[PDB]
Amino acid sequence: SLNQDATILRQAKLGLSDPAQSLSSWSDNNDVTPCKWLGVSCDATSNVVSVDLSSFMLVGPFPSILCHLPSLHSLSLYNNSINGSLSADDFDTCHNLISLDLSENLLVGSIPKSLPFNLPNLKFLEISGNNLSDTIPSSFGEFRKLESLNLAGNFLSGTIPASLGNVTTLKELKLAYNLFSPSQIPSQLGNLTELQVLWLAGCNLVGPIPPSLSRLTSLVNLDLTFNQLTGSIPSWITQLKTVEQIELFNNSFSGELPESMGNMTTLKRFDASMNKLTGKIPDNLNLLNLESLNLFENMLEGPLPESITRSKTLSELKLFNNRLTGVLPSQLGANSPLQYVDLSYNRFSGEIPANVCGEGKLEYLILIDNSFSGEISNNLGKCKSLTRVRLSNNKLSGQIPHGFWGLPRLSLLELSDNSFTGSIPKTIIGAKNLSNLRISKNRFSGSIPNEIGSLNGIIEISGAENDFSGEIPESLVKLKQLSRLDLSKNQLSGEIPRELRGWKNLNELNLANNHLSGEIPKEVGILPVLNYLDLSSNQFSGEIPLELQNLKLNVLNLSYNHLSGKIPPLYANKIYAHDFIGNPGLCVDLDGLCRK
Numbered sequence: 143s144l145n146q147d148a149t150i151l152r153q154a155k156l157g158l159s160d161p162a163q164s165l166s167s168w169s170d171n172n173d174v175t176p177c178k179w180l181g182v183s184c185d186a187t188s189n190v191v192s193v194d195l196s197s198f199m200l201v202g203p204f205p206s207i208l209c210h211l212p213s214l215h216s217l218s219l220y221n222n223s224i225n226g227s228l229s230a231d232d233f234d235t236c237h238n239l240i241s242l243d244l245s246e247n248l249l250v251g252s253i254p255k256s257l258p259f260n261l262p263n264l265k266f267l268e269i270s271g272n273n274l275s276d277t278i279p280s281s282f283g284e285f286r287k288l289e290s291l292n293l294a295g296n297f298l299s300g301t302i303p304a305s306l307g308n309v310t311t312l313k314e315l316k317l318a319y320n321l322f323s324p325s326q327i328p329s330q331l332g333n334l335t336e337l338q339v340l341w342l343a344g345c346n347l348v349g350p351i352p353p354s355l356s357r358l359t360s361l362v363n364l365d366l367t368f369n370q371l372t373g374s375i376p377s378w379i380t381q382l383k384t385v386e387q388i389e390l391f392n393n394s395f396s397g398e399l400p401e402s403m404g405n406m407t408t409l410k411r412f413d414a415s416m417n418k419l420t421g422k423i424p425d426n427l428n429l430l431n432l433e434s435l436n437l438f439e440n441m442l443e444g445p446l447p448e449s450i451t452r453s454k455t456l457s458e459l460k461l462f463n464n465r466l467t468g469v470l471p472s473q474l475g476a477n478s479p480l481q482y483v484d485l486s487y488n489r490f491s492g493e494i495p496a497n498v499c500g501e502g503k504l505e506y507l508i509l510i511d512n513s514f515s516g517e518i519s520n521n522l523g524k525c526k527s528l529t530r531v532r533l534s535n536n537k538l539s540g541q542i543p544h545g546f547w548g549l550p551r552l553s554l555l556e557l558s559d560n561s562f563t564g565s566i567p568k569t570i571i572g573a574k575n576l577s578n579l580r581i582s583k584n585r586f587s588g589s590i591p592n593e594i595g596s597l598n599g600i601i602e603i604s605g606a607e608n609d610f611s612g613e614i615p616e617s618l619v620k621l622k623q624l625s626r627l628d629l630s631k632n633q634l635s636g637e638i639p640r641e642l643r644g645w646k647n648l649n650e651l652n653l654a655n656n657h658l659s660g661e662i663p664k665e666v667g668i669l670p671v672l673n674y675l676d677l678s679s680n681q682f683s684g685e686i687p688l689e690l691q692n693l694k695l696n697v698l699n700l701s702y703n704h705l706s707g708k709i710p711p712l713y714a715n716k717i718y719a720h721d722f723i724g725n726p727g728l729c730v731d732l733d734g735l736c737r738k
């Protein structure tokens with residue numbers, strides 16, 4: 143009993159390599175009964191009933207010998223390196239198993255056609271995340287007790303077999319992420335009336351969801367993402383009394399959201415993004431359990447209904463790239479833990495809801511390419527959770543809230559192409575995580591504050607087309623990660639600093655159309671990744687440094703300055719000419735004579 147089982151366990155272990163020594167309890171000082179060995183569970187008569195070797199890093203062929211344990215009912219080899227292929231014989235003796243978990247291993251080759259006959263008592267079968275190939279055997283329809291089947295993430299091909307509809311005990315059917323031929327969802331899956339989980343994402347499915355699936359009245363999670371299903375989202379999903387998740391992202395669904403979607407009180411997550419839906423968001427929403435609503439990249443029209451505010455656990459709202467209109471519900475966010483809000487590329491208007499970050503969890507506020515107007519609320523100035531703000535291409539105006547500039551987790555601050563006014567405050571010093579500052583095409587004024595040069599991670603400062611004045615702060619020149627500096631079309635004055643070697647990552651320097659003066663520093667030419675240099679329309683004077691000829695410039699523009707001497711010889715050709723026009727004192731040396 144303990145004798146027999148210890149020996150069979152040890153036999154099984156001998157056919158495996160165990161480089162992490164996960165099974166050291168099995169062969170160390172024989173004495174401890176096997177019942178207390180790692181991964182081993184016994185019944186009251188001390189017979190092994192369950193072997194669970196999950197995540198033990200074991201290598202080698204399937205350990206068929208474990209099946210010789212007379213009371214073994216559960217075997218898990220989840221997340222190891224069991225390798226080679228499965229044979230008919232591997233499972234000859236495994237007929238007492240109820241639970242078999244071979245997920246996340248290295249198995250290759252076909253599923254044996256004999257598997258159901260050798261494992262007739264199985265309730266749970268998982269072989270997800272391997273490299274299995276060939277078709278799912280039609281023999282699978284012979285299982286009399288199977289409750290859950292997971293073959294997701296293999297290379298299974300052919301088409302999903304119709305005989306699976308015979309397995310009427312199934313509650314979970316997971317086939318996602320295989321290499322099936324393009325085909326419809328088999329009609330016969332409608333016969334699996336107990337199903338709670340149907341996961342056929344990335345299955346090369348075409349055609350409509352079959353009308354027979356309306357018989358799946360117990361569905362909790364329907365996930366058909368990543369296919370080319372067509373026609374309408376059927377209205378019977380709305381009558382599911384226990385539905386929690388509907389995932390239909392990246393299909394070819396057309397028509398409209400069923401009107402009665404509003405009464406799906408149990409729904410937690412709804413995604414129908416990346417389809418061809420038209421019509422409006424259903425109104426009279428009573429989505430009391432909703433956590434996530436994604437409907438981006440469709441052709442939805444009309445407003446976000448006020449009733450979305452009844453969803454007091456809503457955290458994710460992604461509606462971008464539709465034709466949505468009107469003002470947002472003024473209370474949006476006041477009573478929801480909003481974390482990710484992306485309403486970009488629509489036609490929304492009116493003010494940004496003032497309590498969008500009311501519960502202090504908002505991380506992404508993405509509103510690009512709408513017609514939002516008025517001011518950013520001072521409330522937003524205190525939203526310390528914000529990491530990514532994109533408010534560009536709206537009709538916003540006024541001063542930015544003071545603390546907005548120094549929020550401690552803010553990474554991307556994009557405000558471009560609005561009508562914002564004011565100076566950038568010195569409290570920007572607080573924005574320790576700032577990577578990208580994108581503020582071009584506004585009416586900001588004053589001097590660029592010195593403290594921007596303390597923000598060591600900054601990779602982009604983009605501030606073109608404003609009213610900035612004063613000097614370029616010496617501090618910018620020691621931002622070691624700065625990639626893009628664009629301050630074109632302002633009223634900046636003074637000089638460029640001489641010592642620029644701190645700009646080891648600068649790719650673009652654009653300072654065109656300001657009132658800058660002095661000489662172009664020699665060290666511009668020693669910058670190792672500069673490919674864009676625009677200093678046009680300023681008052682730079684003196685000679686063009688010969689070191690510029692080290693650079694490979696996509697853009698070089700020195701036009702409309704007060705430069706003197708000769709053009710560097712590398713640029714003497716007539717094709718480069720427009721790069722230097724409008725410098726009265728400058729000439730080009732060609733054929734033994736200097737020419738304007």
Ligand SMILES: *[C@@H]1O[C@H](CO)[C@@H](O[C@@H]2O[C@H](CO)[C@@H](O)[C@H](O)[C@H]2NC(C)=O)[C@H](O)[C@H]1NC(C)=O
Nearest residue numbers: 162164195196197198199200220221222223246
């Ligand atoms: C698969 O198994 C390995 C252990 O063999 C797991 O890797 C360990 O996971 C924890 C993280 O929770 C780390 O502290 C260990 O350092 C990891 N070890 C190694 C070798 O990487 C891995 O988490 C398991 N995978 C799953 C999905 O559970």
Ligand SMILES: *[C@@H]1O[C@H](CO)[C@@H](O[C@@H]2O[C@H](CO)[C@@H](O)[C@H](O)[C@H]2NC(C)=O)[C@H](O)[C@H]1NC(C)=O
Nearest residue numbers: 224225226247248249250251271272273274297
């Ligand atoms: C299972 O298939 C995968 C995915 O094709 C193989 O994983 C690697 O695939 C990448 C590129 O697709 C290659 O650079 C490697 O050669 C593959 N990994 C290796 C050789 O370890 C994977 O090899 C397959 N596994 C088995 C056991 O055949």
Ligand SMILES: *[C@@H]1O[C@H](CO)[C@@H](O[C@@H]2O[C@H](CO)[C@@H](O)[C@H](O)[C@H]2NC(C)=O)[C@H](O)[C@H]1NC(C)=O
Nearest residue numbers: 654655677678679680698699700701702720721
């Ligand atoms: C170099 O920069 C100057 C501006 O400093 C460019 O000239 C402007 O070009 C636009 C056309 O897109 C006109 O609207 C402006 O009126 C021009 N400014 C002046 C002062 O004439 C010029 O095109 C750039 N040259 C190259 C080769 O890129």
Ligand SMILES: *[C@@H]1O[C@H](CO)[C@@H](O)[C@H](O)[C@H]1NC(C)=O
Nearest residue numbers: 201202203223224225226227
């Ligand atoms: C199983 O993996 C080991 C070690 O990585 C290898 O030496 C052995 O030949 C593998 N077996 C098969 C059939 O690939």
Ligand SMILES: *[C@@H]1O[C@H](CO)[C@@H](O)[C@H](O)[C@H]1NC(C)=O
Nearest residue numbers: 283284304305306307308330
């Ligand atoms: C199994 O399913 C096939 C295909 O739907 C069907 O024709 C066959 O009669 C079914 N057999 C059993 C035993 O249910």
Ligand SMILES: *[C@@H]1O[C@H](CO)[C@@H](O)[C@H](O)[C@H]1NC(C)=O
Nearest residue numbers: 344346368369370392393416
């Ligand atoms: C959309 O799904 C298809 C499979 O139908 C996939 O090949 C494609 O890359 C996916 N695209 C996106 C953006 O998810």
Ligand SMILES: [Mg+2]
Nearest residue numbers: 580581582604
């Ligand atoms: Mg910008």
